[PDB]
Amino acid sequence: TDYPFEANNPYMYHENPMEEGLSMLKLANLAEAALAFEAVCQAAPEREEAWRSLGLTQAENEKDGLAIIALNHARMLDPKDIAVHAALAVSHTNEHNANAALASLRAWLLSQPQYEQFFFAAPNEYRECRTLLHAALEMNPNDAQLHASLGVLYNLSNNYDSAAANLRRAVELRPDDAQLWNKLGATLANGNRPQEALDAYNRALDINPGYVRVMYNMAVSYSNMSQYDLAAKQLVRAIYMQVTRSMWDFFRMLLNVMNRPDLVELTYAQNVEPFAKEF
Amino acid sequence: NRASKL
What we know:
The complex is a heterodimer of chains A (279) and B (6).
Chain A (H helix, E strand, L loop, with lengths): L16 H11 L2 H14 L4 H13 L3 H14 L4 H13 L3 H13 L12 H17 L4 H13 L3 H14 L4 H13 L3 H14 L4 H13 L3 H15 L2 H13 L3 H4 L8 H6 L1
Chain B lengths: L6
Subcellular location (chain A): Cytoplasm; Peroxisome
Protein name (chain A): Peroxisome targeting signal 1 receptor PEX5
Family (chain A): Belongs to the peroxisomal targeting signal receptor family.
């Protein structure tokens, strides 16, 4: 396997870890759900729903690398699972895999029977995607996933204003969708509008209190605005909820900038408790 | 400065 399964996974022993993973997702316990889904992928690697759920969870748990590995299994097993193509496009965009991101969006659109009929990293592939999505928008004008998909595409080319407009329309249409609010927030954040981003993230966290990616993104935006007390608080939540070293290193920089050398030294132990108390 | 994630 290309997937680095956690050793000593207690769900390996369980009757029905798939059910348990789904229930963990409903509860929003992402780390636990991922482990449960991992157990299913180990025991039954042909189970496409298992890889998809794993991939989906890992990306929300701020692990795009692990997400991609899992989603590619899902994509092999069911090339018409559009949730898999959608998530691959998102994680590849985050990872700046331009070609792979455009391949996923295109597959996302064309895998739907409904739809089946400059940018330096991948110029023509980009134009094609843009054209296909706009043509689809002509066939189905108020489709929130089409607007969201144009948001992903426009993030890829750093056209954060067009991305934000499309994604704002998507959340107007689906205001209880946690992923859409996070996507809008990330867009706004990357487009140097972190205050607005934080409002979107707050909506996302209210829907899914276990959305570790949103928590991380909030640490990022607060750090960008140099509100380090607020960044530190969100980052502690993120680290605690995630379970990593990259986040601890980011946390270390916050503690340094705020002139807390006593706390910086404590980050190597990687115990979140003194920091949970502190913040 | 820091990148945000979709």
